[PDB]
Ligand binder design. Structure first.
Ligand SMILES: [Fe+2]
Ligand SMILES: [Fe+3]
Length: 188
C-alpha cells in the first residue's frame, strides 16, 4: 500500500534496482539520465518543482513496477502517461504535468521552434516519428492553454540535456528530501 509516507522510498527502490539499465539509444543509464536532468536544474537555480519533474519524468518506462496502480493497456504503452498516473496520487499537479506532457513538449517545440528539429539526438528523432510527429496548429493552441506550460518546457529541455557521457551528480537519495517536500506540499 502506497501513501505519502512511503512513496519516496518506493521510487528510490526503483532507482536502486532498475537505474543501471540502459536509456535506449543514448550514452546514459536510466538513473544517470534522470539525475543529470535534476542536477542541471539544481545547478542553474531552477525551482524544486522543475528539479523533481526532471528527476521523475521517465519512471513510467518501468511498467512491471506499478501492478498496484491497476493500469489499462493504453496507460502502459506510453511511459509519459504511466509515469503521470503513478505520480498524480502523491505530487503537485505541476510535477504530474511535467511528466505527463514531456513527449507532447517535444512535438510542440518541433512545430513552433524552426531550428529545434535538427538539434535532437537520432534516438529522439526516431521516437518523434512514432510519437506522432510535430504538433498541428490546433494541438499547439491546445497545449499553450496549459497553466504549467513554462515548467513543462523547462523539463523537456532538461530531458534533452541529460544525456552527457560524463557528469558528476548526487544520487537519488540526496534528492529524496526534496521529493518528500513536493509530496508534502501536495498532501499537506
Ligand atoms: Fe521520456
Ligand atoms: Fe527522458
Amino acid at each position: 500500500k502506497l501513501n505519502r509516507g512511503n512513496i519516496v522510498e518506493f521510487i528510490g527502490g526503483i532507482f536502486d534496482r532498475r537505474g543501471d539499465e540502459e536509456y535506449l539509444g543514448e550514452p546514459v543509464t536510466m538513473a544517470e539520465h534522470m539525475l543529470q536532468g535534476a542536477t542541471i536544474a539544481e545547478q542553474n537555480g531552477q525551482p524544486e518543482e522543475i528539479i523533481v519533474g526532471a528527476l521523475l519524468h521517465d519512471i513510467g518506462h518501468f511498467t512491471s513496477e506499478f501492478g498496484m496502480f491497476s493500469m489499462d493497456d493504453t496507460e502502459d504503452r506510453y511511459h509519459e502517461e504511466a509515469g503521470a498516473e503513478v505520480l498524480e496520487q502523491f505530487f503537485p499537479s505541476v510535477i504530474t504535468d511535467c511528466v505527463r506532457y514531456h513527449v507532447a513538449a517535444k512535438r510542440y517545440l518541433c512545430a513552433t521552434k524552426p531550428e529545434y528539429f535538427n538539434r535532437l539526438s537520432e534516438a529522439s528523432i526516431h521516437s518523434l516519428k512514432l510519437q506522432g510527429g510535430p504538433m498541428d496548429a490546433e494541438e499547439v493552441a491546445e497545449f499553450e492553454k496549459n497553466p504549467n506550460l513554462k515548467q513543462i518546457i523547462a523539463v523537456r529541455y532538461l530531458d534533452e540535456a541529460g544525456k552527457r557521457a560524463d557528469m558528476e551528480t548526487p544520487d537519488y537519495w540526496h534528492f529524496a528530501p526534496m521529493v518528500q517536500r513536493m509530496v508534502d506540499k501536495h498532501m499537506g
